[PDB]
Design a protein around this ligand. Structure first.
Ligand code: C5P
Ligand code: C5P
Ligand code: NA
Lengths: 326, 326
């Protein structure tokens, strides 16, 4: 019962070797509140407490560590306004690699500062996706640096999948894993890890109502773009999924639900008040799906893990969300 | 993909509750020697280091603990020349239950003494299977005591299955579990635990060439007796499998191989010299199958757990086996 996929269980196992004693397993405690609400056992995987505040250090470290020395000498380049920038920057520091990160003008101040702190050279260029991405292109041509994709890359995908191995390690009798989706690298990685070892474990995706390239592609049967507008779950603001990640998702993901901006906010408020954890919109998507009622036939009297993918949210936004008549 | 079986995953979960803080998980370390020989990862589950020296305390404790107080007041009775006697006796002590164990005249001295030590009343009766079993019958009629089957009982089976849950707990990515068979309670319990959670995990049985009721039944497609003669694996000297255990095995067990007396001896010698553990014939069956070469297409480049079911062997027999030109 195999699959001819661009990533495989062996790739994840290599990633585990490369990350050992460098990147560490995150806590995954039971949530009493979500368990009570959902009438089933609910566990929170704290990738918000992973280094840099999201899981993205995993994929970036794997891809950078897997490079040959000749390749590491070339230097690397990446492009992000967010968590990928931080992961690539920190990974560069840990491995002693020279790295540039192209961030768009208009990228959030906190995230520019953080990726600076992590040691990589930050290049603020472009008020436009084409202008920003064209700088990365210009950098590849003239400098020969190696591009590090945020999700559409076999090594990046395989690094995110280490999360799936940790889940079955901490909870052998898990039934469902609920995973947020932007480009699809996170869920692709996890699906491969989970389905390769125990295919009876359900892997279910979650995206914002406002923007869900992958959901649209998943339900249409081919890659389509979808974006009606922006979202609180800014980490998963992706109109078009990656090629490798779509192939894997169509093959291995059980379902993908959609949640509204209000449900995401409610999920963040609930995580703060009832579980004492800070979450960005993307990090709360899975928990929003659990409260939506849409996963009810999967989660009642079962054990379900919700992925808290990230906690990189400006304090001003924390202030606003907690300050609402709520 | 369900099964209409006399035991189910919930029964094992109840057994886990009943055993918690009473019966404890056994170590399951890697064997370097067996891994080298088999060209795959091999792990030894040390049920020889379970209380009483075999796993049988698990099934007996579960069945006895599950009784109502009215039922516990009736007293219990069992029949064995070996490890079942010890498990029932110790379980009685732990639960404060009054128990009789009918052992055949001719039962090994060490095993009579041990079940005495464990507090139950020992009744030595019968030079004959019919004479011995008829005493248990006489005891049931006249005293109203509750009989405790060695394997053909849903609560007994479910207690042995706790071993399967421990395996996936200690090794989530296990591929094969190799289990000795007498009456079939051990393997039945494990199969249900393993297959209910992860059916991609292979469960494979092992019996002596000299006597293999279950193997014969498994390959014939109905219950048949088989016994050509006695065996070193005295714990698995059973001509006819139980009814409940056969139904489960036919349904859930991947294969059953047979090993010779020489292979069993070789396996015991190997466990002593290379892994420093004491094993009875039954406890070494699974390891004998691993060295036989018969499981080669399952174990190379995989992770396999061998069940060391028991260590209750007379020192005189240890002296003889280690004293051979070997
Ligand atoms: N200069 C920095 C560096 C890190 N951080 C944030 O602090 C959190 C913890 O970072 P470390 O894991 O690197 O300690 C992360 O969410 C990260 O984004 C920050 O807000 N400003
Ligand atoms: N009187 C006794 C009591 C126990 N034993 C054995 O000692 C080993 C350890 O027993 P305990 O787990 O009860 O300490 C077991 O194999 C058991 O059969 C014995 O040989 N003689
Ligand atoms: Na575990």
């Amino acid at each position: 019962i195999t699959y001819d996929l661009p990533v495989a269980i062996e790739d994840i196992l290599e990633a585990k070797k490369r990350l050992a004693g460098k990147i560490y397993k995150t806590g995954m405690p039971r949530s009493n509140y979500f368990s009570e609400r959902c009438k089933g056992e609910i566990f929170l995987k704290f990738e918000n407490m992973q280094r840099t505040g999201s899981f993205k250090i995993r994929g970036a470290f794997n891809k950078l560590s897997s490079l040959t020395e000749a390749e590491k000498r070339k230097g690397v380049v990446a492009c992000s306004a967010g968590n990928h920038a931080q992961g690539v920057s920190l990974s560069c520091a840990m491995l002693g690699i020279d790295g540039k990160v192209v961030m768009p003008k208009g990228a959030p101040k906190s995230k520019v500062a953080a990726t600076c702190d992590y040691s990589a050279e930050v290049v603020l260029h472009g008020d436009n996706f084409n202008d920003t991405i064209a700088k990365v292109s210009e950098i590849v041509e003239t400098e020969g640096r190696i591009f590090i994709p945020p999700y559409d890359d076999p090594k990046v995908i395989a690094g995110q999948g280490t999360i799936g191995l940790e889940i079955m390690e901490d909870l052998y009798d898990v039934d469902n894993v609920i995973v947020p989706i932007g480009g699809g690298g996170l869920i692709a990685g996890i699906a491969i890890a989970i389905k390769s070892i125990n295919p009876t474990i359900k892997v279910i995706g979650v995206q914002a109502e406002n923007v869900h390239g992958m959901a649209a592609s998943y339900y249409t049967g081919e890659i389509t773009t979808h974006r009606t507008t922006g979202t609180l779950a800014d980490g998963c603001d992706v109109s078009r999924p990656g090629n490798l990640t779509y192939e894997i998702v169509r093959e291995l993901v059980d379902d993908i639900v959609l949640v509204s901006e209000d449900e995401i906010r409610n999920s963040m408020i609930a995580l703060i008040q009832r579980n004492k954890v800070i979450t960005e919109g993307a990090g709360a998507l899975a928990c929003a799906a659990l409260l939506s009622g849409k996963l009810d036939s999967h989660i009642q009297n079962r054990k379900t893990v919700s992925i808290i993918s990230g906690g990189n949210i400006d304090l001003s936004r924390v202030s606003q969300i907690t300050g609402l008549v709520d």
